[PDB]
Amino acid sequence: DAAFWTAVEDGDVSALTAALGTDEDSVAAVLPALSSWRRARKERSTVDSWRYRPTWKPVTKLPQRTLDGTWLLVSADGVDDTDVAEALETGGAEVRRLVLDESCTDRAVLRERLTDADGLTGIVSVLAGAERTGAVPGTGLVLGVALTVALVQALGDAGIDTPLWALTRGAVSTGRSDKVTAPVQAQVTGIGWTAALECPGRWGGVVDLPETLDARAGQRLAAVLAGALGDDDQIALRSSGVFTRRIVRADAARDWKPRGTTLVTGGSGTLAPHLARWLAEQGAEHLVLVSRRGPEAPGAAELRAELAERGTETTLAACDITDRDAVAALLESLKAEGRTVRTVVHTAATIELHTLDATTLDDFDRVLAAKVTGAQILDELLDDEELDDFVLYSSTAGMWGSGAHAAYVAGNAYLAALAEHRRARGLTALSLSWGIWAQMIRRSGLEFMDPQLALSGLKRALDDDEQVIAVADVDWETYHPVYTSARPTPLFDEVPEVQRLTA
Amino acid sequence: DAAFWTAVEDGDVSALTAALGTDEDSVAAVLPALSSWRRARKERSTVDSWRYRPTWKPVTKLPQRTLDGTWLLVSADGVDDTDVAEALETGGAEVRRLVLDESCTDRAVLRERLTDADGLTGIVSVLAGAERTGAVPGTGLVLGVALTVALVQALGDAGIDTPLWALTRGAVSTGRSDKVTAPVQAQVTGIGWTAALECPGRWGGVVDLPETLDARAGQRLAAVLAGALGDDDQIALRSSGVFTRRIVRADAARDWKPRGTTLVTGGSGTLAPHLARWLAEQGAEHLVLVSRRGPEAPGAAELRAELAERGTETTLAACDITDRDAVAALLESLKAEGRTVRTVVHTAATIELHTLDATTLDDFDRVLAAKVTGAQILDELLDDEELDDFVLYSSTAGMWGSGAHAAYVAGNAYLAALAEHRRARGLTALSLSWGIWAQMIRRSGLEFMDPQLALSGLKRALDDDEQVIAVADVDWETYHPVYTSARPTPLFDEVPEVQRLTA
Numbered sequence A, B: 001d002a003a004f005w006t007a008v009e010d011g012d013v014s015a016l017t018a019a020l021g022t023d024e025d026s027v028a029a030v031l032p033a034l035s036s037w038r039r040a041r042k043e044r045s046t047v048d049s050w051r052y053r054p055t056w057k058p059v060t061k062l063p064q065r066t067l068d069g070t071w072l073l074v075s076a077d078g079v080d081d082t083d084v085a086e087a088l089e090t091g092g093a094e095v096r097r098l099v100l101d102e103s104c105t106d107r108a109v110l111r112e113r114l115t116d117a118d119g120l121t122g123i124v125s126v127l128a129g130a131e132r133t134g135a136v137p138g139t140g141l142v143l144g145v146a147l148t149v150a151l152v153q154a155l156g157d158a159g160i161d162t163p164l165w166a167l168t169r170g171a172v173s174t175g176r177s178d179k180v181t182a183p184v185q186a187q188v189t190g191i192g193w194t195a196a197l198e199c200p201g202r203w204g205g206v207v208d209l210p211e212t213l214d215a216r217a218g219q220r221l222a223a224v225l226a227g228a229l230g231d232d233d234q235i236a237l238r239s240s241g242v243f244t245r246r247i248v249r250a251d252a253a254r255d256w257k258p259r260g261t262t263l264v265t266g267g268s269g270t271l272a273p274h275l276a277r278w279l280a281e282q283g284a285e286h287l288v289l290v291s292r293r294g295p296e297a298p299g300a301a302e303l304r305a306e307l308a309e310r311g312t313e314t315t316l317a318a319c320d321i322t323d324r325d326a327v328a329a330l331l332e333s334l335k336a337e338g339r340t341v342r343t344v345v346h347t348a349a350t351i352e353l354h355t356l357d358a359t360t361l362d363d364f365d366r367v368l369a370a371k372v373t374g375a376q377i378l379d380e381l382l383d384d385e386e387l388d389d390f391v392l393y394s395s396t397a398g399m400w401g402s403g404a405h406a407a408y409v410a411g412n413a414y415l416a417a418l419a420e421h422r423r424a425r426g427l428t429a430l431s432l433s434w435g436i437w438a439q440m441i442r443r444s445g446l447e448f449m450d451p452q453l454a455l456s457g458l459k460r461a462l463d464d465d466e467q468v469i470a471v472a473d474v475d476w477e478t479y480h481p482v483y484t485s486a487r488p489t490p491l492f493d494e495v496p497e498v499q500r501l502t503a
């Protein structure tokens, strides 16, 4: 068999006409079409091993357990704690409220408030409630987001090794009819995931909270906070009970074709070229590539021409997607040609590394602002009528944590949520998590992907009206052990090849 | 893939010319030859899962251990015990010699000698040394063979539950240059294997002994007898150390063609017809089918004709292979045509069931005498020059034990040994262990085989100048558990599918 297929895989051989004994003239009559059919099969089959979804697994049996000692409950602005204070009280603990203000975004200012606060038993932050937007210049950062990075920083500054937990509400979808209601808080989740990795000694976990925290949910939360679930840190809480998160392989409904005008942000970018070629191969009649540099960008003028030869008019535009009125200018402009944007693809991003201890608000802001303010602005303006697609580029760094990627994970998890939140209200949106496209890097367990195969991923996704998926080549037998080397986790236990390993 | 091959497997479809897109006229031009190539592949691949060899696994680390209490050492005629008595003495035990005589072949007569012999610690029989041939009328049974069945019978009669062990010397080949020197004793092995199954409470095991039992080998034997090896009952002892037996799958060198005259015993038989057809398909120009009935046998005259149409003169002969002078008559006869017998195939057998407690010497003799005296007689007479093949038909009931098959196992294990003994002296011989050919039976874990596939087994064997192999379809996941239900054993641990199960 391997012999047989190898022979057809390469072609230009008679090892077959031997092994089969059918003349020879009727071999190369069939050979290419068979050689094709297995090129195709080989490529569907590999791609298949690249797709993954995050999913929520019910906890069948929640070990009964209560809280002990003292717990600091960290809020801000006008974030209500009561409902959560009550659960910790009735769950057996003594509660220290620590309210914060915008000036605490400063890690020095904040550490000054952690006096009379050692030998705590646990810490609990409901800073994700602080969704307010204009309260820390000159950043565009969300209040609670900043305070969160602050809080983590101050505690490592102060040397407080007591375990920290973050609570969101409305940032996860356990599925069913569990709408995402506050995509913003998924930023904190994002940091949470990452802090798990960076400072595993003092990170508890993160918990989405149900619309209403009743008594049972109270008790449940208290048990989770206590330590009930061991190493299981990503947790949702519903009135139906408790779920922990897993990453699963996707199971191996229509067609898809680029109509009207297609917008692509991050045009000056690295991946942008592959996508634009690809889209021109799908019959794209007009591509708008947007990017601050835009026209006068290092590959801009030649790929413009390369696409103009295949029949695709591609207008380069210079615009900053962080600019409500520039983008509004451009959008309203084309509508006056008049175009119709049927598809947006949002690759606008600046990937800068940075650790949580090191980073500053301004690094954090720099990384987020393009992806994020990008999407909200696109989300505000775009017509939402007729435009049948709205694809967001994302990363596994953001379907789960990565060391030193806190902001990018924060930004990427927001994309997914904003995607889930839009679908929730009946609007189209796909957040797709790549995946590294084509050595220091490659030993981490990640493998690089062919841009075309990788775009096969995206085709399938677009055909299937997905809302969030990953497309990535992972060698789990080296990835997993790297990943867990400090902190252990069940996040990947349901990935078959990761099971074999565990045994 | 399964789709793809199914389509070609059955043929007469265009699901391919679709899935491939290569016209359609050039599909059925190739389809049959491809459809053939996978018929062939499918059949090599199944057959492959049918082949097995017995093999001997070195015991790396022999738990140090000695013997305790009293051991009865059972001999006969002029079988020397000393060398073995000394090992039990120096190995820490008190020794009761119990010599037997031909009249003890009677289980009543024998039980009268087991008075003053309870609360023994173990029993040891070296009855396999009694290879003498004319000492129990009217049977042709080997002395020690009969005494062995006797001994087992008397002990269950007497209710003595102390564990029994049988020693042979020269009946196994650990491989290397380990010649088989006394094929006869493998009969006792054969019973031994079976008694393991029938009365597992009082059976110890069986041990081949090295040419010379020195002190180290003494110590080793004493440890084996003590209980060192636990559940491991088939054991060889060499100066290099101790081996236990395993059944392994064979690994998936020339060609083979039936020349001159081919002799087939068991001609009137069930399998004989398939073989004769098969041999006529290999270009056999003359088949001698021998069998007491011979000419006037239930299918004889028509298969004779059926083979005469394909060009193969097949002479039916009436002869009893238990008759040194009849067989000599017939052999010498044909040489006077003159023929030359190039190939013998020895299927002459009477498969009657019978338990060890129930059986009588005469049942035991009936079953053996055809297979066995058959082969010795063939072995004595045949020219051994020019005749390039000498195939013996055997059974897994005889590559290992079966309940109630003691005699057939005894006879089948002798075939293998006589095969190994002939090769040892540079004579050709193949003992092939089938395998059931095509429901009460089939639930045991055995599956029936196509006569043609099954003969593919034999082809490969004959091409490869094998000396002993099995060809059998076994469902191990039901066979193994049936097999071990009373008595546990490692005999099959090295068969991959039996490992999975154990876990």
Ligand SMILES: NC(=O)C1=CN([C@@H]2O[C@H](COP(=O)(O)OP(=O)(O)OC[C@H]3O[C@@H](n4cnc5c(N)ncnc54)[C@H](OP(=O)(O)O)[C@@H]3O)[C@@H](O)[C@H]2O)C=CC1
Pocket: A265, A266, A267, A268, A269, A270, A271, A272, A290, A291, A292, A293, A294, A297, A319, A320, A321, A322, A346, A347, A348, A349, A350, A351, A370, A393, A394, A395, A396, A434, A435, A436, A437, A438
């Ligand atoms: N490359 C890879 O292998 C991987 C990529 N990804 C994801 O895929 C996407 C593409 O990555 P890649 O192309 O490598 O990233 P790049 O950094 O190459 O692309 C960023 C593009 O966005 C533009 N951009 C930056 N800031 C702004 C702004 N304020 N307004 C408008 N445009 C801006 C930049 O153009 P300009 O500077 O001209 O404005 C640049 O061309 C990313 O969003 C990333 O999350 C995920 C995993 C791996």
Ligand SMILES: NC(=O)C1=CN([C@@H]2O[C@H](COP(=O)(O)OP(=O)(O)OC[C@H]3O[C@@H](n4cnc5c(N)ncnc54)[C@H](OP(=O)(O)O)[C@@H]3O)[C@@H](O)[C@H]2O)C=CC1
Pocket: B265, B266, B267, B268, B269, B270, B271, B272, B290, B291, B292, B293, B294, B297, B319, B320, B321, B322, B346, B347, B348, B349, B350, B351, B370, B393, B394, B395, B396, B434, B435, B436, B437, B438
């Ligand atoms: N059938 C199966 O599925 C299996 C077969 N086997 C092995 O394959 C072989 C063939 O089995 P099968 O054909 O079923 O057995 P059969 O009982 O059908 O064949 C026995 C043949 O040998 C002849 N025979 C019996 N006694 C004597 C004698 N004293 N002299 C000459 N011939 C004698 C008989 O003919 P007549 O009475 O005319 O003399 C009979 O035709 C056997 O040796 C067996 O060990 C192993 C496992 C399964």
